[PDB]
Nucleic acid binder design. Structure first.
Ligand SMILES: Nc1ncnc2c1ncn2[C@H]1C[C@H](O)[C@@H](COP(=O)(O)OP(=O)(O)OP(=O)(O)O)O1
Ligand SMILES: [Ca+2]
Ligand SMILES: [Ca+2]
Ligand SMILES: [Ca+2]
Ligand SMILES: [Ca+2]
Ligand SMILES: [Ca+2]
Length: 901
DNA sequence: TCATGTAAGCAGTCCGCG
DNA sequence: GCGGACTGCTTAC
């Protein structure tokens, strides 16, 4: 097999590399890597190395990496550019793996671990590590085993061995319900003292040294705790055995309001799953407790135990250990679904970076571009200092707030990357500038044509047309990967809808789910077999289809994020290719493109309808337009349609056969106007929206920019079994809105769009009457909690104290003098409830850590004093009033003449 | 919240507005 | 009481 790296590090003048050799074995080597850098040279000096602008360079080979870094410093002192890859391990990888890396995940040791620490005096701080580690569960992907290290004897209690037999049993048998599928994979090791536990753990770690290390909050808790505990007990040298090269660094992570400390383990790639989830999931959750996320992702119940976690080991050690094991497994289950480890390996090996660098699009693109240029013997420019400067972004149309009955949307494929490719925007393709007219002059095609030689953006920039820039070349490759995975995702989505349709008529039989590839549209034969299947088999197929769709989503949306990140990186001062001329060239072209096509679409539809100056495009944001289809439907007449699917088909055909060709014509004209390199503005129909045929539903409404709701029947070629609400920006979509209120507002919207005013009024009246019965957590608002200390003046709110911070201060006074009470953590999320006048907490609100029940001491008082009236007005009535006013509807029935009867 | 970008919405504070 | 200046937070793209 072809060799591939696992990890790479620079340690002084040595590269330390762990890798898989040509025989599939894990090896480690130390290489005295001699790096090269470059200086500009005279044209008279023969060279094969050129900078990205075509200027010749001489290669300077250094005796060692320290000599190279010192030379960079002297070049700065002289005032001359030091060219080339200054991150020497990236240069090392580029030299050692000069080919497309084909990796074998089965040879990569991925470790998932979690530790338990009993602490009677509050949260066990990793920097202090003053409490015994009393459990470790460490799953190894190569062995496919859960290694459980269990401390039986502690200063906080001596306990009996954990029983795998009790662990396997149902909760109703007094067991822990450790999943049957992992029972045989547990290797259980009890210890009579912590020192022997940790020594054996370190010997185990040496034998099975993680390449990828993950788990939940491992970077902020488990790793620093283990390192510091071992350091406290045995000394520094023993703790450094967590590094395969015996090197570690206490790294300071700095944010906007303070800093924290993590441990860098050289020769390991730490991918904390919480960080993977936050970057790659495209959710924003009210809580990031593993219990909350597992419930959301997997629909598994909360891990239930009695009393505080600080007493769980002594009261129920059996459950304590079982829950530690289950916690490790839940992360594996989440990854089986989301496939973020797979994604990270894919992206890391593609770029030729340390795997943990996938968190940084700037590092990722620096490496991709470096490797691309190196292939052509080209030499990358030195990174420079730049001041942070604001620059303009996208255009968003101000919509007229209203109901909109029939709506068809259109969207540009991968807009910013397509602009880069179309215009040929790159550091080395800049050709010059032209005199800019106001943007509206280009939008309306009255400005002088910018250039008859170069490819242009309406910000004034011109680009070469003779050859593709490196940025267009490399962005195209990732775009093409993204396109492939999106195809799989949408096929799985369409396949899911076939199964949902079939589930209306399930067969009374005992059978099995079909062995099919959900990434490809079901054949006619498969469709015929599905129509004969039982509900049990259909539901299992639906689950598998939906899991295939999730895998495709992960692969596609994050490749989209990477390419959109390149466009953004051009406007970040730390990017080697930072250039506000290129950043603005993209965004300004986008503004023109959207408004140009708005004009073209309006012109086209006014022509086909025989009107003048009427606005068909009701809204647009960045790269999408929303077109009113009322007149198109009315031109045939609603009574002519058999059912909802009939007018959906009609609009689908109209958009494809009439509108898309007109849109294409309009964009081809724009491409010629700007003299662009290649026409890549591909705007396709996105959504078809409207009320059910014959109903009193309103179909859709807008309240303002980035705030709308649509009843969608078909999305990007997926014809839904049941209509789906597309809601953007409204309170139903915000993590700050109480869970039960999101639910109620969604139903209000569903009723407005699908059923009408009377239906909405019925539901409102019921919700208002019954809502006080809702569980307090379900009606609590949520907020991130920053700068608690800044607004704290002797335990009371200082000037301009935010409402949620006021709540935290109230909580802190209520729990004061109790080391055991859950503390609110700076920068994390809190639940927030309003409090009625004259409550014993002495303020108008209270807040506590999100994802948790409020502590028993004050729970009863919170429940008694919760201000239901305020909660309802703020989270429910105020937003509903916004929706209904925009839609010209009433959520409460107005008085009429019929009342007199 | 260490980690690519901008536009823009709503909650809430403070305070003007005769 | 609503709106502007401002902070804080959160989405849409
Ligand atoms: N996270 C982001 N970072 C930077 N720019 C972004 C981000 N999201 C969106 N944009 C910008 C660049 C996009 O090309 C443009 C339009 O976004 P959007 O319509 O979501 O997707 P897209 O057009 O890039 O891809 P798609 O092919 O899925 O439509 O907005
Ligand atoms: Ca735990
Ligand atoms: Ca798009
Ligand atoms: Ca699309
Ligand atoms: Ca059937
Ligand atoms: Ca869009």
């Amino acid at each position: 097999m072809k060799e591939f790296y696992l990890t790479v590090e620079q340690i002084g003048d040595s590269i330390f590399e762990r890798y898989i050799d040509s025989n599939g074995r894990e090896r480690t080597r130390e290489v005295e890597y001699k790096p090269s850098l470059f200086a500009h040279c005279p044209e008279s000096q023969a060279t094969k190395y050129f900078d990205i602008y075509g200027k010749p360079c001489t290669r300077k080979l250094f005796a060692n990496m320290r000599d190279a870094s010192q030379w960079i410093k002297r070049m700065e002192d002289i005032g001359l550019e030091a060219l080339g890859m200054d991150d020497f391990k990236l240069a090392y990888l580029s030299d050692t793996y000069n080919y497309e890396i084909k990796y074998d995940h089965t040879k990569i040791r991925v470790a998932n671990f979690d530790i338990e620490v009993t602490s009677p005096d509050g949260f066990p701080e990793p920097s202090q590590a003053k409490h015994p580690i009393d459990a470790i569960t460490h799953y190894d992907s190569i062995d496919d085993r859960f290694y459980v290290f269990d401390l039986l004897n502690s200063p906080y209690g001596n306990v009996e061995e954990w029983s795998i037999e009790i662990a396997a049993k149902l909760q109703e048998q007094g067991g822990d319900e450790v999943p049957s599928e992992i029972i045989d994979k547990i290797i259980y090791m009890p210890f009579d003292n912590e020192k022997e536990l940790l020594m054996e753990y370190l010997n185990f770690w040496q034998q099975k040294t993680p390449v990828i290390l993950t788990g939940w909050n491992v970077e902020s808790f488990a790793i620093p705790y283990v390192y510091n505990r071992i350091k406290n007990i045995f000394g520094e040298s023993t703790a450094k055995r967590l590094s395969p090269h015996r090197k570690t660094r206490v790294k300071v992570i700095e944010n906007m309001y303070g800093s924290r400390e993590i441990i860098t383990l050289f020769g390991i790639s730490v991918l904390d799953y919480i960080d993977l989830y936050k970057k790659f999931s495209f959710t924003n959750q009210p809580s990031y407790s593993l219990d909350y996320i597992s419930e959301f992702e997997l629909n598994v119940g909360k891990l239930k135990y009695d009393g505080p976690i600080s007493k769980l080991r002594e009261s129920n050690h059996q459950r304590y250990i079982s829950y530690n094991i289950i916690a490790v497994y839940r992360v594996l289950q989440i990854d089986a679904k989301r496939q973020f480890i797979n994604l990270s390996l894919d992206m890391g090996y593609y770029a030729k970076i340390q795997i943990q660098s996938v968190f940084s699009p700037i590092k990722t693109w620096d490496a991709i571009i470096f490797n691309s240029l190196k292939e052509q013997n080209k030499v990358i420019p030195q990174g420079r200092s730049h001041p942070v400067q604001p620059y303009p972004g996208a255009f968003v149309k101000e919509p007229i707030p209203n109901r909109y009955k029939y709506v068809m949307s259109f969207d540009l494929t991968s807009l910013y990357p397509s602009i880069i490719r179309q215009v040929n925007i790159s550091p080395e393709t800049i050709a010059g500038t032209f005199k800019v007219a106001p943007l509206h002059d280009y939008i309306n095609a009255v400005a002088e044509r910018p250039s008859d030689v170069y490819s242009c953006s309406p910000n004034g920039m011109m680009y070469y047309k003779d050859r593709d820039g490196v940025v267009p070349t490399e962005i195209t490759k990732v775009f093409n990967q993204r396109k492939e995975h999106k195809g799989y995702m949408l096929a799985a989505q369409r396949n899911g809808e076939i199964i949902k349709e079939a589930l209306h008529n399930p067969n009374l039989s005992v059978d099995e789910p079909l062995d099919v590839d959900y990434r490809f549209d079901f054949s006619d034969e498969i469709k015929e077999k599905i129509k004969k299947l039982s509900a049990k088999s259909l539901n299992e197929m639906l689950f598998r289809a939906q899991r295939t769709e999730v895998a495709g989503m992960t692969a596609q949306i994050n490749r989209k994020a990477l390419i959109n990140g390149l466009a953004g990186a051009l406007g970040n001062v730390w990017f080697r290719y930072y250039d506000l001329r290129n950043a603005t060239a993209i965004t300004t072209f986008g503004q023109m493109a959207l408004q140009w096509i708005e004009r073209k679409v309006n012109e086209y539809l006014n022509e086909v309808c025989g009107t003048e100056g009427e606005a068909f495009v009701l809204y647009g944001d960045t790269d999408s337009i929303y077109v009113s289809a009322d007149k198109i439907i009315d031109k045939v007449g609603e009574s002519k349609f058999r059912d909802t699917n009939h007018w959906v088909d009609f609009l689908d055909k109209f958009a494809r056969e009439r509108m898309e060709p007109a849109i294409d014509r309009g964009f081809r004209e724009m491409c010629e106007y700007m003299n662009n390199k290649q026409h890549l503005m591909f705007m396709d129909r996105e959504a078809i929206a409207g009320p059910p045929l014959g109903s009193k539903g309103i179909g859709g409404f807008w309240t303002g920019k980035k705030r709308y709701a649509l009843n969608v029947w078909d999305m990007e070629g997926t014809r839904y079994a049941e209509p789906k609400l597309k809601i953007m920006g409204l309170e139903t979509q915000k993590s700050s809105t109480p869970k039960a209120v999101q639910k109620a507002l969604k139903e209000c919207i569903r009723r407005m769009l699908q059923e009408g005013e009377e239906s909405l009024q019925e539901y409102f009246k019921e919700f208002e009457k019954e809502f006080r019965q809702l569980n307090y957590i379900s009606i609590a608002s949520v907020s991130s909690a920053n700068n608690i200390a800044k607004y704290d003046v002797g335990g009371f709110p200082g000037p301009k104290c935010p409402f949620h911070i006021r709540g935290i201060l109230t909580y802190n006074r209520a729990i004061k003098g109790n080391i055991d009470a859950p503390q609110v953590v700076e920068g994390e999320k809190v639940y927030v409830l309003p409090l009625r006048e004259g409550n014993p907490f002495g303020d108008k609100c209270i807040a506590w850590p999100s994802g948790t029940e409020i502590t028993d001491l004050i729970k009863d008082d919170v429940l008694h004093w919760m201000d239901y009236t305020v909660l309802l007005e703020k989270t429910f009535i105020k937003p509903l009033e916004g929706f209904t006013s925009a839609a010209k509807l009433d959520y409460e029935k107005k008085a009429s003449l019929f009342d007199m009867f």
